[PDB]
Each structure stands twice: as C-alpha cells, then as structure tokens.
Amino acid sequence: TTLLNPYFGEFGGMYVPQILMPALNQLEEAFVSAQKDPEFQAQFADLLKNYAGRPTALTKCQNITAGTRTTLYLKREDLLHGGAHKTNQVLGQALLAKRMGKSEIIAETGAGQHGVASALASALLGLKCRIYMGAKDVERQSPNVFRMRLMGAEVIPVHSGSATLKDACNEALRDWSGSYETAHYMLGTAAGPHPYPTIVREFQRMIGEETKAQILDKEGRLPDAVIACVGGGSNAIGMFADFINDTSVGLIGVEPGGHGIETGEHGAPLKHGRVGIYFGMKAPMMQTADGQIEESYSISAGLDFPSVGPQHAYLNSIGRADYVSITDDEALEAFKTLCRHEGIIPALESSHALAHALKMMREQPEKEQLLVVNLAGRGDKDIFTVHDILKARGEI
Amino acid sequence: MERYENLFAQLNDRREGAFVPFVTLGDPGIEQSLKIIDTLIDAGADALELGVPFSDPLADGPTIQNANLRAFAAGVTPAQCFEMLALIREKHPTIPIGLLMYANLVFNNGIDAFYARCEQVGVDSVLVADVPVEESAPFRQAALRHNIAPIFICPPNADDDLLRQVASYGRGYTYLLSRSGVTGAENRGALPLHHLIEKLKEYHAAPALQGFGISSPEQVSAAVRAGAAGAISGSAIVKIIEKNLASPKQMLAELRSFVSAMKAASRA
Ligand SMILES: Cc1ncc(COP(=O)(O)O)c(/C=N/[C@@H](CO)C(=O)O)c1O
Ligand SMILES: O=P(O)(O)OCCNS(=O)(=O)c1ccc(OC(F)(F)F)cc1
Ligand SMILES: [Cl-]
Ligand SMILES: [Cl-]
Ligand SMILES: [Cl-]
Ligand SMILES: [Cl-]
C-alpha cells in the first residue's frame, strides 16, 4: 500500500525486490511529509537560490529565428551550478536523505552529469557519496569521473552486463537493497520505481514554474509549445509539469534518433521501443525480441537511458504530450547553429530539443509561434566530440 | 504446484528438510548445464531452482551475475531454456522445478503466454525476483491458471500484513529470505527467523525454504532446526561451476560431494 498512485495510467509501478519495498514506502512518506513542511521548502529554496543560482534566465534568441514568425526562448538551466538541470533535484533529494536520517548517498550515472550533481550536493550537505558508473562510461567520461572524485565521492566502475548505464542502475539498487537503513538512493531521472518519477518531477518543476512567470512577464501570454529532450525524462517533466493543466500549451519531448530510427541505432523507446518491465517500472524499453534489455544509442552521452519515465509514456498515451526524435546529424547542426548565432554552446542532449524547434520554425516559417526550448545543460563537455566529428568530415 | 506438496509430505514422513540448489540454465553451456543438473539430482537435490539468463539480474550478487554472463556467452536464449526445461521434466517426473525469473522475461511475450509455456514444459513454480507482493496480482493469476505455484518472498523485516498476504496468495513454498542484500555466499544472514517461520505456519502458508547466503551444511541443519521445510543454495553451487570451468569432470565431482553433504545435513 502507498499514499499515492504508483502508476500513471498503465505505466510505472514498483517493480523492485520485496526487500526494497520498505525503502520506497519510507521515501514516499518522507516526500509527502516534506512537501507540506515550510522548513523543508525554505531550506530547498535557499539551496536552489543561493547555492545553485536560481532563478535561471529565460533568453530570447532573436538571431536564430530571423526571417520567420517563430519567437524562441531558451530556459537557461545551462547556467545552473554544475552546468545542468540535474543539480535542482539532487538538492531536494539530499534534503530528503537528511530528513530520513540517512547519511550516505548512492547514485548512478551514465554521462557523469548526475554523478557530478550527486557529488556536489553530498559534499555541501556532508553526506558520503558513492556513484556507480558503467566501466565503459568511466573510460569515456574521465573528466566527469575526476570532477566527482575531486568532490570526495567514490566512483565505482561497473563491469557486469554491458558495462553501461543500465548496469550502473542495477548496481545501485543491489547496493541499496543491502544499505537502505543508512543510505539513500539518489536516482537521477524521472523514472524507476514509485515514488521516484513523482519526486524527481516535483524537484524539477521550478523549471516550468519560472518559465511560465517569465514568459507571461515578457510576452503577456503562455507559450504555444515547450520543448525538451528526453533521456529518462527529468528535465522534460520539470519543464512540462506546471503547464500540464494549460491545455493550449504544447508539450513536446525529443528522444534521440541516433543514426536514424530505421537503423535501430537510436534511443527512442517511447515511440519506437516496446513496453517492458525493468528498473522498477513498466515503461517503453529498448529491448531484444527475447526481452533482454538493450542500450540506447545517441551521439549525446546523456540521452543513454534505455527506457523512459512512466509519466511521459502516460502523457503520450492520452495525447497531452507529443514525442518526436532528432538524429545525431540534426542535433549537431543545432549545436553549431546556436554557437554561431547566439554565442551559447548547448549540451548535445539539449541540442536535440533545439533541433526540433528549428525544424518547427524552418518547416513552417510563416507560422506565428512562441516556443520555449529547455536548455538543460551547457556544451563545454561536448567540444571534443564535436571537434573530432568535424575533423573527420574535413569541416576543420 | 502439486509436486511440492508431494515432496514436502514425503520429506515430513522421513523427518527431513529439502535441499534445493540453484543454477543458471545454460551455464556454462546447454549440454554442460544439463549434465550439471542431472548431477545435482543424482547427488540428492530435493527440488531445483533454475535461473533463466537475463541481461539485468538486479537481485543477484557477482557470482550469479557471472553465471548469467557465461550463459549469454554460450548464446543461451529463453526459447532454448524452455527446451532444456522440457527435457529436464521428461527425465525426472516428480522433482519440483521452480524458475527464478525477472519481470521483463515474463512480460515479454505476454504474461499468460509465459505461464502457459511453463505449464507445457512441466515447471512447478515461478519466483519473479523484481515483482513484490504489491505488484504480484497479474503474475500470480496467470501462474495459478496454468497450475504453477507463485513463489512469494518473506523478507526478514516482514510485517504481519505481508505475512498474511504471502500466506494467502503463495503456493508450493514460501521463500524465507535470510537477509537484506543480493544473492551471494560471501554474506551470511544475521537474523534468527524462527518467529517468521512460526507465523507463516500459523497462517497456513506454503512450507518455508530459507534462501540467500546458504553455503554450509550447518546452515541447512539450522534452517530445519528453526522449523523451515528446507534450504536453497545458489552462489555456493555456482562457485563450484566457476571454479572448475576448465575441468568439467572435477566440476561434477565437486558438485556431487557438495550437494551430497548439504542434503545429508537436512536430516532432522
Ligand atoms: C546534460 C544532460 N542533459 C540531459 C540529460 C537527459 O536526462 P533527463 O532526461 O533530463 O533525465 C542528461 C542525462 N545524463 C545522465 C544519463 O547519462 C547522467 O548524467 O547520468 C544530461 O547529462
Ligand atoms: O545462495 P544465494 O545467496 O546465491 O541465494 C540463492 C539465489 N537463488 S534463488 O533462485 O533462490 C533467488 C531467489 C530470490 C531472488 O531475489 C529476490 F529475493 F528478490 F526475489 C534471487 C534469487
Ligand atoms: Cl521568476
Ligand atoms: Cl506542428
Ligand atoms: Cl534461522
Ligand atoms: Cl497457501
């Protein structure tokens, strides 16, 4: 039994070993309690503002839309401490850990952004932090690994399975199943077993809340659409949540199309996978015909979660939100375009969202539309990847 | 499930606990696995728990993680596992065969279809490791429709409501979990489970098998002495496989002596 519905329609649930159910229950109760507690809310707001630097700018991108009837704003989560949106909810989850008397943090990471966010929150708040990361990811994300270690976190390479994010997810739950009395599992996306999709949403919802107030102030009306990339779903739901009841506002989520949906080398399970049950939830999955879980492929490391948050699958099902894909090459163009036209280097993840907005604009250039793209991260981390591609293409 | 009822009745009559080994199907190959399983039975296994190789076995420690990887390396697929199961049942009419599954493999081709195939090959029970009692309804329904016992976990920190639920809904046996954490012989349970065993009996639960961390004869005896119907051992068995990959003969020899000793310990 729980306080809240673990499902969004048919999607979600609590598919963890029985041993972990008391952990999930405790977390749910503490969250429900925290949300009613003005002290908790005040401390969270204090960290968000004074440590992470909220509120974030909403930037109007005039150059990129010139000659069309598109107005485009970027929500600047790239300016957040840590350089991505991941920082928002780790601060809330660390406060919850403290609320519950936990003194240790477990986190998974793929690209390393969530690991870095977990590490910085843990350092600030005096929690001992261990991060699981697939050995292949450790190998290719040396800079992030070093950042985590500088901040005092233990980074544990995971060599089992495919040695990537899903494997790190497994390892985190295995650890938690034996350490939950003292450790909190700081899951890094709006996915996994209830209550994580709900908590991550509520601890990211300031993105959309701020966006709403900022767009009303600047434009005198709500956006025609808000657009966000979808790895596991946290930045997207963070942007969407405050607009769900504003049914005139389009909610568009962008999954990575990789080398092309038709190649099967992508990370777009919501639209092109198959519903499965894994990592604590019933959700669309990348999976073999045999039901073995597969990796998500994308040029962008952070869009590697091989499933998707259950709330997204639900919002899709009912037609409240629409989900699309953007390919590697589309994302790369959008990356280059923002650099040159706005002097902003976007994360390759969020470059997917930007790419779809540019498509909406270019396809129908005389359509009057007010769009917000969630710029969930900065792209400093991506310049080596971009360099190497451009070099191979003889663009440089 | 009726194989379990018959086993437990016969073991009760002989004043004995059940000794139940776990292996991963197809580890380290199909043929070798079949020989391994026949050896376990010949050496005195009372029932089997058999893992279907899965990409993400998140209730398993490294020993069994490695078993899954070895089976994958041999190219073992769920279809091949069903064929193995049919042959195992064809060879051994009465031994209860329980599967250790993860939810995705059960859900993959349809939950009903999964259990129907289980019935077709002669499986007796299914434990789905990542499905808690809270989520169990569609699995337990499909199981029972196909004459399959749904196996429920009774964690060492069960409250009374969980005990009553497991007692009502379970069949075959009740899995009495030794400790928190994941499978592995390198970690022994700490908590005495006598009280949980008593409460399960009060509620007419399926007989309890203790599992997790069981690697020694004394632990088998201890399970029986505490009132459980028997004990399951996985990692300890799989380690013998891992240890002896380079010597199939020595492997079977060591499996035989280990299983023989563990079964001997089940005598009250
Ligand atoms: C800069 C950036 N933007 C978007 C996403 C996508 O994450 P949501 O869908 O918003 O949850 C990520 C993810 N990164 C994870 C997984 O590799 C991680 O760091 O471990 C990211 O790092
Ligand atoms: O001897 P060990 O420590 O390897 O333990 C035996 C493991 N084999 S098993 O099939 O019984 C088994 C039973 C339950 C499991 O997970 C769950 F509890 F969450 F359901 C996993 C494996
Ligand atoms: Cl504001
Ligand atoms: Cl459109
Ligand atoms: Cl005991
Ligand atoms: Cl019963």
Ligand SMILES: [Cs+]
């Ligand atoms: Cs414009």
Ligand SMILES: [Cs+]
């Ligand atoms: Cs994805």
